[model samples]
Target: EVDPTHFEKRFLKRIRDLGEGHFGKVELCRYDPEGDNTGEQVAVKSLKPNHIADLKKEIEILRNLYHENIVKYKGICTGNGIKLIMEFLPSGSLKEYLPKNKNKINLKQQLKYAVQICKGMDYLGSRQYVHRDLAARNVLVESEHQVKIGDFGLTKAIETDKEYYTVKDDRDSPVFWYAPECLMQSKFYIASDVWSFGVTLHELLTYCDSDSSPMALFLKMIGPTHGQMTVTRLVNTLKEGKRLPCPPNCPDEVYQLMRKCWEFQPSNRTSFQNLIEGFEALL
Candidate 1:
């Protein structure tokens, strides 16, 4: 178990602004007192005053979940405000890696990361939790090229006894990465997460570098000329929820797995066990 006081001291000293998103600010810091000093760094996510409940919920989820690919919780604080200490990824979020390399990624490397994602999702699914906000921005890669899933603020754990349903909210949802049912009704399940995974695959196919300039150019060409375009438009087609601009060099097996993830009916989606087995075969 990690000591909370140790985190406060370390966080205060090494905290550096990493990135900012709708959730809040993320800071990078070291964990060990006398090691390489740079060998064990973690991302500290500070929650806004209004998001206290959500922050507590994330802590509870982390306490319950234990996996290699999911970000590990070193400690948490609920003092003047809520703070969560978690594993840090030096390579940053997948969002930082896209668009710079000409809008198309190497299929081999993309699949390698995809396999890791499938493994992580499979583990989460087994625990009856669904990452409601799965996207490139939430996928973090380390210097070793290992992938870990991050940002569980929007996640929900499904109770085995209850029937799940979507709730309506005025806040802007992740449109592009969401499945049709989840986007339409706000209801999500394990299968809905699969839908998001498929969209993530789409994002990986389109952008796979550490810069955003190329993505900007690609968006200008096929995206809306004015106003912000919903995320759905970029990943799925409007009518039938078909994937847009398929990856050119993707293997048929990998493509088939993505299609299974994007299945129209939630009940028809592939099981996590099956998904993991398929990905392992590719490796």
Candidate 2:
């Protein structure tokens, strides 16, 4: 059986509150009994016992995903409650990085980071998992411009025969990062993730400003009366029914790829393999 007292004393030491999410308070904790180093600094995700089942699912997902851009799972602590030990990223989420630096990242640097994201997504897609939550806030940069996609609470795995699945009452969906279909139906596929990727690309270009949501900017750029009409037109043009505004000074090839990612029909969206190939060509 599990011993709460021994587990707390030997493996888990409450250090400080790291942050809070919808589920519970995240804490910074020391994780090694043999040595004081604490397993290379880990974020201990603490949640209510009610969430144990979901936490177990997340653990399973993390265990299966082993890619350079995905956050590494160190281990888990279970006793009176559940705790997840994950690799601590000093830089935190991309959300924290952009606002502090200002609403712009150098174009070249943005593309470099974007390329890494694409590589990571490619790996995930190949494994039949859809990140579902692909946004700046979910990406964690460790070092050397390396980024790891984290926060898998909304991730889902699909079978080769399945096309998509609708999430019931998806309160976790971020409106700004969602594709139109996902926003309208609460259903998602790998293609919906591609739509999120397009939004991510825009966020990288604009440096995560609240004013930079494609719909908002598209409206601003075209004027209120015509803006909605123009935005609708542009959205309709995307192959799979995805939508985004063209970034200023963006190369035609990049814009085309972004368009492909936003297609309205999930099946029409560019494949991850194609996305990788296009990104390589862009580089």
Candidate 3:
């Protein structure tokens, strides 16, 4: 608890620039009541204009969640601006850090992270949460663990009416990582996440680097405007292989499992439960 007056700035002191996101800024900080170095390092995230409503709706979700694969939420600061204090992930996001580490990671390590991702998502699914956006960018690395799922601002309570849902806010991610249904219909389903997970595994295994996901641009960029050729050589090259190439070093079975996740039909994609089994078998 804190004095309701200067709530947001009261308990934390910004240590340094961590990074920025759609909402506002993130900083490495100390959350000491006295505002001193003795306090442990924490990550503080500020909320911007459009994000406040949906963001706070999940604070309680973060509060109730506890898992090794889940980033821990500490507390919040409010009034001037809402600042969320979470357990600082010194290693940062997986997408930015994976390329450097991919060369060094062994098969066990790769399977470890893949399985861990599924485990995290499985936990969320058990709680009826749907993480519409599941990409390397949204996953975080902490110490030796494979990953801890973070960035729940786009998450929703799993429901059924005919199919899935879409988020009001979107971010730039791999153009091709999305399930066919997602791009074709703005759909959000466990299978949609599974397809992205497969794309993530492709990156973890083959280093098929993906950036922000701009849904419309992804479709426009890949779908031929006309002619036999495409706009970019990169997208055209992918058409040559029909999809992401199998990593030179990746095992055939493992890569096949990854491909299974990428199956075009929603129901055909690998389930999170099966992902754990697949990774374990590889080990």
Ten-residue region with minimum lDDT total, candidate 3: 208-217
For model 1, how does the per-residue alpha-carbon lDDT over 1-283 read when each residue is reduced to its tens digit? 8655346544333558877556666778776666555545677788533777767788789766787778877776443677777877766777776555433446666777777787888888777777787888888776435677877877777866854535545275676566677766667778888878887876776564323322353354447554455444543444445454446666778778877887777887886567767777876
Quick one: ranking by TM-score, best first?
3, 1, 2
> RMSDs, each prediction?
4.5, 5.3, 4.9
Clashing residue pairs in candidate 3 (N, C-alpha, C atoms within 3 angstroms): 8-77, 8-78, 172-212, 172-213, 173-212, 173-213
TM-score of each: 0.78, 0.78, 0.80
Residue 186's lDDT in candidate 2: 67
> Where does candidate 1 stray beyond 4 Å?
1-6, 9-11, 30-40, 98-106, 163-165, 168-170, 209-237
Count of clashes in candidate 1: 5
Judge candidate 2 at residue 141 and give its lDDT. 74
Q: State the lDDT of candidate 3 residue by residue for 1-283, as single tens digits.
A: 6542233466677789766655656778876776546877888777644667666776767878999999998877773446667888887777667767766667788789889989988898778777766777678888655589867766787666544666444554344666666554566787788877887777666543544233323444466354334324334434454555566677889988888886667776789999899889879
Q: What ranges in model 2 sit over 4 Å off?
A: 1-11, 14-21, 32-39, 101-105, 213-243
Candidate that scores best on TM-score = 3
Give the residue spans of candidate 3 off by over 4 A: 1-8, 102-104, 160-163, 166-174, 207-241
